[PDB]
């Protein structure tokens, strides 16, 4: 018995990450085993850690937590440093629009657990963590129970399946801070402190949890690992375009007919995501903008881009929030400003004051209460959140809003 979850729609053309998670219920270990689950683990334990890293490298797998960093490369960096090492699954998923990771957690937890075990083996970590946001209580209980299931079947503990490899997975919960998805703040939180990002470099792979080499990977990234071992890197790389191969998850929301999570190859276009897969727009109204979570704003002239990590690609977490022709861009920008105001950790002065002022002033603009000085101030602050920032939040808190100012000047001009 778990807390009530809304039944998010999920659809796949690849039948990999969403093979089970396309059905909105918990798939327990017996059902996972019937589908051939945990045989990739068994295969992996018969391979060298080095060989696993090599396959993951050659698969072209990239991080699903927003930056698209090559996973194998990350793991290679970690294992160049003396142990012990730690493995962390980032399940903080708190960016607006983004709900892809929870459906793996809540519906196919063993896919994630199997990937964690393989990944931990690959990097020589005997202690792994899942850090799940506090607002995912059902996912937390589901994972705790699935870990117990895995222990009882001998996939966790000491000397897993006679391999001599030991692993414990600990589940930690967040408590309301978006910034705890930033990998160094996550580590700080795991250490029992406030979620304050650390200056990088050093990257976690050099100095992470308790100062030791630590790999942080996103839920989606890790859920790919069992497929790479199962299929081999060649067949994996045959999925989608050769340079951005493999499945990707796309959480689509807002003004579409079929909001939900889509498992698609990365040669799919943004237009296809919206019209081919997500059923087109509510009321068949014209697309005005797509917000890539709280990161970017694409206009209706930019729909033909691929959902890959190329320079002209959509990139990120594949988060697609659709606004149509009647949606007020300034109102929407205010919501993005409010998010950053609520999430800056306050360590860096331009971020602390900038995220606050951006929202404060934009609220005045929206309500028709802004002076000429408020307008000029808003413009200045928007451009000056990033200086001295030590993490990506300060670097991007003004980015989406600036794009709206450039791409929808007429609507902003009306707020005069």
């Amino acid at each position: 018995s778990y807390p009530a979850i809304p039944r998010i729609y999920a659809e796949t053309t690849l039948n990999m990450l969403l093979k089970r998670a396309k059905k909105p219920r918990v798939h327990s270990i017996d059902e996972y085993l019937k589908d051939g689950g945990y045989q990739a683990l068994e295969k992996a334990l018969n391979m060298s850690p080095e060989e696993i890293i090599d396959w993951v490298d050659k698969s072209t797998l990239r991080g699903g937590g927003g930056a698209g960093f090559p996973t194998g490369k990350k793991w290679k960096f970690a294992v160049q440093n003396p142990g012990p090492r730690y493995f962390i699954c980032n399940a903080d998923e708190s960016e607006p629009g983004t709900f892809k990771d929870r459906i793996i957690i809540e519906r196919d937890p063993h896919l994630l657990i199997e990937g964690i075990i393989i990944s931990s083996y690959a990097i020589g970590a005997n202690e792994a963590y899942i850090y799940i946001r506090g607002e995912y209580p059902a996912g937390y209980y589901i994972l705790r129970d699935a870990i117990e299931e895995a222990k009882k079947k001998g996939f966790l503990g000491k000397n897993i399946l006679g391999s001599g490899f030991d692993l414990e997975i600990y589940v930690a919960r967040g408590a309301g801070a978006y910034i705890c998805g930033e990998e160094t703040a996550l580590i700080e939180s795991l250490e029992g402190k406030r979620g304050h990002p650390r200056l990088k470099p050093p990257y976690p792979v050099q100095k992470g949890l308790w100062g030791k080499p630590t790999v942080v990977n996103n839920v989606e990234t890790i859920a790919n690992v069992p497929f790479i071992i199962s299929m081999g890197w060649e067949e994996y790389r045959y999925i989608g375009p050769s340079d951005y191969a493999g499945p990707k998850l796309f959480p689509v929301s807002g003004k579409v007919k079929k909001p939900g999570v889509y498992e698609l190859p990365m040669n799919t276009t943004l237009r296809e995501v919206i019209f081919k897969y997500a059923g087109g727009t509510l009321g068949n109204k014209k697309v005005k903008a797509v917000f890539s979570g709280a990161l970017d704003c694409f206009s209706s002239e930019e729909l033909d881009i691929p959902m890959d990590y190329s320079p002209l690609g959509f990139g990120g977490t594949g988060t697609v929030i659709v606004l149509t022709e009647e949606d007020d861009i300034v109102e929407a920008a205010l919501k993005i400003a409010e998010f950053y105001e609520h999430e800056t950790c306050g360590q860096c002065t331009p971020c602390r004051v900038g995220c606050y002022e951006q929202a404060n002033l934009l609220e005045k603009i929206y309500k028709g209460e802004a002076t000429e000085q408020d307008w000029e101030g808003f413009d200045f602050v928007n451009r000056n959140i990033q200086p001295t920032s030590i993490c990506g939040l300060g670097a991007v808190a003004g980015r989406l809003i600036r794009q709206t100012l450039e791409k929808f000047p007429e609507e902003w001009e009306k707020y005069r």
Binding site: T98, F99, Y136, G192, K193, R194, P259, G260, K335, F339
Partner: protein
Amino acid sequence: EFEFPEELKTKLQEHINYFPKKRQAILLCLHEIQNYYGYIPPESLKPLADMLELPLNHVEGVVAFYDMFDREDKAKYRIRVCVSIVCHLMGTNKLLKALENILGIKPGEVTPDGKFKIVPVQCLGACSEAPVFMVNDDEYKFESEVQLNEILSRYT
């Protein structure tokens, strides 16, 4: 002074024993305390700090930092309403209006009986089901006032 009831103290001890180091259990402990009392009692932090082997100052700062924790208002049921972009677009205001109609309260307020508190929250990671709300750990899409009324009737 304050002391935890034994059954709670047991649960806190389980969390503290769970991770390799005691201090890693701080957030699980605070969730447990909030679950038990309907808020974080100020007086609970000193004994918690002792069990975690942490300075009180450290614990106070953590409570302050993490938005899920509430030291001010006791409530049996927290109605967390998403006020972020997708829910706003798809009808947060209709949900809030429906809540005011049923419960007589607005965001930040607690009903006089201490039963319900409306807590505005950032994106709950269920945006396809906008507008989203939680009642304690349970999460729902808001469809209508009639639908909401029946959901809330399940919490006594």
